[PDB]
Amino acid sequence: CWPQLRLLLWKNLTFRRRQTCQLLLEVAWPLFIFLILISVRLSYPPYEQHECHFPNKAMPSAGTLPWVQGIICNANNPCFRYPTPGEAPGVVGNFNKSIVARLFSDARRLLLYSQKDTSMKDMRKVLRTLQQIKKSSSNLKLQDFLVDNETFSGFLYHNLSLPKSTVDKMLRSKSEEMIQLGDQEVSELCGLPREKLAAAERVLRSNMDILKPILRTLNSTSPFPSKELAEATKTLLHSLGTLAQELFSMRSWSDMRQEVMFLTNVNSSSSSTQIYQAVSRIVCGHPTPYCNDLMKNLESSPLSRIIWKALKPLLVGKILYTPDTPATRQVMAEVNKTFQELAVFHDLEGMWEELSPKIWTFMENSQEMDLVRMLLDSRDNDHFWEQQLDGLDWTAQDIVAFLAKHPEDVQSSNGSVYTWREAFNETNQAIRTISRFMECVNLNKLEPIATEVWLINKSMELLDERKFWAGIVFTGITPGSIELPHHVKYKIRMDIDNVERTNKIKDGYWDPGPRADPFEDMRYVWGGFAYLQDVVEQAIIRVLTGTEKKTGVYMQQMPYPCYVDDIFLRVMSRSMPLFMTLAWIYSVAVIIKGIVYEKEARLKETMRIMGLDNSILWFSWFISSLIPLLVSAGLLVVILKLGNLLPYSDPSVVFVFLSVFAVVTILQCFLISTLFSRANLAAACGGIIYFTLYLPYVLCVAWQDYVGFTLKIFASLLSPVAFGFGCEYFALFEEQGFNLTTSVSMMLFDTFLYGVMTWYIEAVFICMEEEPTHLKLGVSIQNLVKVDGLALNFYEGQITSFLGHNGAGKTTTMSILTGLFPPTSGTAYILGKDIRSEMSTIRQNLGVCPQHNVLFDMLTVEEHIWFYARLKGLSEKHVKAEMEQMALDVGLSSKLKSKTSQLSGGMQRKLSVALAFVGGSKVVILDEPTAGVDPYSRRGIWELLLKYRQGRTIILSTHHMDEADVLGDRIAIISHGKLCCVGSSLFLKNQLGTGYYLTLVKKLTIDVSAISNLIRKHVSEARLVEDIGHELTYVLPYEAAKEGAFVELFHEIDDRLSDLGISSYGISETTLEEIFLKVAWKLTQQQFVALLWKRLLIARRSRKGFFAQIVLPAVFVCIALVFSLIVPPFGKYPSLELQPWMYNEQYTFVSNDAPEDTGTLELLNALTKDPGFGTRCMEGNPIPDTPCQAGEEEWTTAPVPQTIMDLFQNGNWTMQNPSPACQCSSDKIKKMLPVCPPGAGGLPPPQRKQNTADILQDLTGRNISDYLVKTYVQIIAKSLKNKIWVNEFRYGGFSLGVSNTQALPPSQEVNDAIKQMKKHLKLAKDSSADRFLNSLGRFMTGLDTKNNVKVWFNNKGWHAISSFLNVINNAILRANLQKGENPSHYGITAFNHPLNLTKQQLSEVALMTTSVDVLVSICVIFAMSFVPASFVVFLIQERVSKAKHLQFISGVKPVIYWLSNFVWDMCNYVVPATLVIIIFICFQQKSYVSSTNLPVLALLLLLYGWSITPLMYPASFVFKIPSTAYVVLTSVNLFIGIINDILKSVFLIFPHFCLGRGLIDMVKNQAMADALERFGENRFVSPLSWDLVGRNLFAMAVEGVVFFLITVLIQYRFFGYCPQFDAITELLTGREHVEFFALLRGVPEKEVGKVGEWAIRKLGLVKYGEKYAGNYSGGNKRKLSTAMALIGGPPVVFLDEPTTGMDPKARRFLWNCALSVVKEGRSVVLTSHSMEECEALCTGSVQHLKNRFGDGYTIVVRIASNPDLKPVQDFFGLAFPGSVLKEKHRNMLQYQLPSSSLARIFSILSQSKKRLHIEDYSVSQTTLDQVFVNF
């Protein structure tokens, strides 16, 4: 069986090897598509992010400064890549390195020190004691004061204009110089040098006075003289020493000024990142017109956009409020207390202004400052004070301190400048700048509003002012004195731009990454919502309970474990089949086209005839079409593995999966192919069928409702879902490198089911001659039983013809001869071999040739003949020799390699019948060969048949008469399934033949009675059988031939041929055909309405016809409506959300860090009592919540695996501080989405307790940062391997704790210190000192944290932050209440509900809605441009030799025909138009009761035909292919349908008709939407639905198609009957056909039927009148076509080939009707191929044509044997030298005598009849075919 399959695959591949265009594109398309895919992939490189930790935020509950820093420091969430110390369980503040906090702590230290410092009082009492004992110590540079008992040189000396010394008589040029020198040298130790210098130029007389100053000792030795003041001086030294140590131990103000100087001091001062680095180091560690000007500059400042967006609303925004209930007035009080806690800086400018002169004069002129300066520099101070300062801290120096302590002027500037004066400049400048900046903040942001409508109006009014902060709206009952209803409910209404969208609560589809973009997702921490939430909760708790703050709250994001952004890979691997199988769509279309093409010309059936079963053909198609699929899959695997697209999977498994999918899809192709019967129809519809087969996978990918065995239910029945599921498994296991085995099994089962379905569809869709025993019997059929009984025998070399009526068999008989259907209880001896006993050996030697030619197109003759010889089953040399021998004599040695498609039809038939004889088949059966063949080639095919008749048993079953007679030597006639007669032609004629016929011809002018009487005189048996123009025919019986008068009458007619008016004569033998029959204007309007009456019938009768013209658009608009009713409006941002967990399944965790049970224990208890984890209060408030408080109150640990020893040895080499496990971080070349924990990071299962829809994990002392990162992956990987499409595991928890108490004593001491300070140091009760001191006290009080909780919120959940903040604040309030009856009653809820959108936002959402409705528009335009496809395809249907030309012969005025067609097109278009108007008029989309929708949509839809249908007509003029425009027109309409350019598109689409329709519809829809949204809440504008913008342009563009219709009519104008092909509409009936043609003829309607019912009776067809035309046979169709010409009876008629392979006993009425038409008196014209029609109907005359152009007489004679043949030959050769033996066989021969004179031949044969024993003899003339063969 191998050679059969080999040759079968050979021809299968040669169908494609000879095309060179389909195979090339088939190979190129997948390569090009996947190269484009790879280019797209490489255009999007994967993004990799490290495992990054997030800095913790702060909130006003903690303190103003921490969250101010959080706003300014970390507004980007920079992903520190390592655990921030804030994320540690214990330490939270994260702000040691912040020097601003250091400055504030130093200020607090200074306040607490000055609370208990008495240095100033010591100075005052020292000065008082000095004044009341010494009374004179004002010893400045000029003069020295000393008024006492003169303990140490008590005297005075003044540096004045003259030398004055009150110790003696100074007596003074020299005096002034000495005084000036002393004043210049007035220093601690310069007095002695000045005295020495003076004494150098003076005498010792002034020396004695110089002796007095020596005891002065620069006012140092004097203090030692008084013992009472010594203790006070020592106390002063100690006090100033410790004060200086404290002042120099801050090291913060100096560091900040040093760091701020150099940025604006360099000459270049170029802008760079240095300023940002310095600012960050100041705020964190290493890792009116002026106000507008500064804000604009900050906005334009680089790297400041995010901080500006975070800050601007904070300090410029304003809030709103509710009816001013006194309790809510207290809420204002608390909130604006919290806000004014930051407002300390407003009064610092006033403090500077009020105390600058005082502090200036105090340290410049007061005696206390002078005493301090004097004590700061002394020998005793050098010994004691300097040593104390040096040992206290690393201060600058004692001399350095004395420099900037209390000077009088600038000493030197060139050397070094460091003085108190420059610092005082800089402090003044800094406070001026601070005041200028702080005058930009509107801290008066409390605006009560009573009504909600005015509330919202003022909200938009402030928003348009570019300043709007959040807005709080309570739900108070009445303005009553009762504070709160114990359950607080409010909505924080804030604008859209600053609050996250409230439409969706989750991310939607799962997406890797922490989702922590600083600007795009932090909208709850930079938009300020969460700050308002926390502040309002703190104020409410203060109102209801009384505790001051007792709580701080921090925000911390959930750390994320080193993801990777491979979104493209995931999204493509979720949908690889689409763009991978586009190429396979092309391939399956090609395969189905090939299969239906070979099914068209019935190649499969003929192949089955030659002895092959359908199974081998199916297997060959399988292999030959799988091989290209296999190579395509190999190329795909190569481009995937080497393309860096799907690594981590072996090429072998993907190749195997692709091969399996190819097998399944090829079996699906085989299934879907056998249901179709047209080539291009199948080729076009294969892609649509595959789309319909594939879409359910896309539908089911999202529903995920088919987890169970229903998945197998839709997998076995449907192929692409299983492959998509295997693709899903590949995507899941792609990174970490139901199951694939299940997918493979489902694919195999689906393939088997498809094969079974394909097999089922294929399976369900007297007269007897004496037989000479000398000649061998080749086919001896005896006892044939069929459900008919007959028997017949055939000879080895005898030609045989089989005749009948096509109804009594001859399709069962040849089928029995072949393998179509075995006989029932019968047998047939073929070459002595039984067909039932032998079913193999008989097939290879059985030739056959059916009606349809077997010719593989795109192939030459050599491959056809070689393939057939191979299929017959011979060797190589044998088939080569047979091929050469057949080619030598067939007549194909010229066209050795010519294309069979280029061969003529007659040559094609000759080649087919030649193929029927190749291989030396001993038996061959033909079946009406040479039907549509050239008459010239008839003789060539006859020559081939007579040459191949040497022992071959040729069988003919033809409907032709002449061929069966002249060729066939024995024929059989069968009646009603019974063999009526059989025998040779002459023998059968001998007893059942009609009388001999003789024909005479004329030149009207010849008497007929004269010749009739003359002939009747000689013989009385002559009878006239016919009388037609210029012709005459007489018949004489064979019985009593009367040879005497016979030859005599020939003698007179030869002698008197020219004597009478006759011209010549002829002989026509009794034709076998009759033997076979015997044995077995008002007219214009009438035509216009006639066309419409014609066309209404197609719609009225085609119930099962092309009804998809209505159903399909309706369904395709239904699907568009369903799609539009599901998509989100995009304008429903407002919503009414609560803030519970609001999540399906989750559980949090509580970490009681620092278990010192100070105040944290109470808060923890409040989280685990009867009130519960949420906001419930003895009732279920959240309607999703459904409390269902079921769960044990005792902690239960989850079961543990056998890894307890692993935990035991984790303590070794991994301490308590780290508890990690190694993680598989992505490599440089190797990567994955999870990170795999080899063991279990955070292995010990934390304690569990189920309370309410959650089981909180009581963590304690665990490394939470590591534990969360580990367990998150440890759970997500497990929940993703099964691919449940799982959401995030945990959405957030929180860790408690207590801040370190290393700071200064609590605010209870700071406030008392402030109170003690203010009453001292010139206490004032003004509006500046009191307010500033109170603000400073509040600022100090607002910087402590006795405890602080930290909310570990997961940012993936959009509303997690606010919800968890609300939960913890509820816990805080429940814990703070004292001696309450029950904490379950209380609780707080905080709705989020944004404002209404503004003008720009409303316009944007309207545009988005338009973008969404684009798809609805494209679907509608698809349906409305798809509807005219039916009209156009019917136009081509009637155009292809059916009605166009045929109506063109009839007077129809072609101008009005197209107008009538257009009128019908409009009249039919309304129904789909009305249905598509009604389809969405029941709903409330795109149309309403308003007059702004219906007039502009219904009219547009109705009149769209006016534009679409005229343009379709020119697309059908030159279109020589039927029923394929239905696809190409739809495709081109789709391709058409799918700021200068936008403005010019109005004129660009003005001449166009299709594209503008959808655009204008969208303009109308968007205009209506914009009008409704604007008029809902804004001013009124005139709707423009029917205005000149879109509607008038649409009307003009559509109405411009009248020109297109006129152009189509002009193109049509520019370019009896019966054509060769039948011209009948395939669904109407013949009765209505003749009615239509009669009505077009001109007969009035009152008598059209009487005419039609006449014409049908002229052609019979009583049983086929009012029936379906498509069920008619060829004979009935030809009969109807012939009647179509004779319906009106034109004076001249044209008829073409009346008989085309039609059954007998029916065509006789055809000749009768033709003769009736001829004899009625109307001239006719006829042309055909069969000369029988011409000689039977056509009347130079045929007899005259065959007389001179034709050959001579032809005689046949039979003698009873072989030896008797020689005497006949000798006698006829001697008597007649001119004779030709054309045919000769044993016992019968043919002679051709080219002599016109015939009388002597009859005389010779009659004279000596007895001697040579003549029994049967007859003479005839050459047929009309002979003369045309000669010509």
Ligand SMILES: *[C@@H]1O[C@H](CO)[C@@H](O[C@@H]2O[C@H](CO)[C@@H](O[C@@H]3O[C@H](CO[C@H]4O[C@H](CO)[C@@H](O)[C@H](O)[C@@H]4O)[C@@H](O)[C@H](O[C@H]4O[C@H](CO)[C@@H](O)[C@H](O)[C@@H]4O)[C@@H]3O)[C@H](O)[C@H]2NC(C)=O)[C@H](O)[C@H]1NC(C)=O
């Ligand atoms: C819970 O578990 C997690 C596990 O991830 C712990 O996280 C670790 O935290 C420590 C510090 O808290 C991290 O240590 C840091 O390592 C960085 C890089 O270390 C590599 O490079 C150094 C130098 O070449 C090598 O010696 C070392 O072996 C590594 O190869 C450094 O940037 C850090 O040092 C810098 O910062 C500190 C602090 O500012 C300075 O004092 C240093 O001088 C230096 O400038 C630091 O040492 C560690 O990488 C984190 N991961 C792991 C796996 O250990 C959490 O700490 C733990 N929870 C708690 C509360 O501790």
Ligand SMILES: *[C@@H]1O[C@H](CO)[C@@H](O[C@@H]2O[C@H](CO)[C@@H](O)[C@H](O)[C@H]2NC(C)=O)[C@H](O)[C@H]1NC(C)=O
């Ligand atoms: C902002 O939007 C809300 C809700 O869409 C409007 O609230 C309306 O209030 C009035 C009177 O109660 C009623 O029309 C409805 O109850 C609410 N909805 C609508 C759609 O009207 C509110 O009027 C809007 N504010 C502005 C200024 O337009």
Ligand SMILES: *[C@@H]1O[C@H](CO)[C@@H](O)[C@H](O)[C@H]1NC(C)=O
């Ligand atoms: C700051 O440093 C001190 C060490 O003196 C430490 O006790 C304290 O916890 C640190 N605070 C923060 C917030 O890191």
Ligand SMILES: *[C@@H]1O[C@H](CO)[C@@H](O)[C@H](O)[C@H]1NC(C)=O
């Ligand atoms: C809020 O208004 C002003 C501005 O901050 C402030 O002085 C006042 O004290 C605050 N409100 C109350 C009720 O104290």
Ligand SMILES: *[C@@H]1O[C@H](CO)[C@@H](O)[C@H](O)[C@H]1NC(C)=O
């Ligand atoms: C700034 O203060 C210094 C202090 O010595 C002084 O010299 C200078 O004049 C001051 N400048 C102004 C503009 O007041």
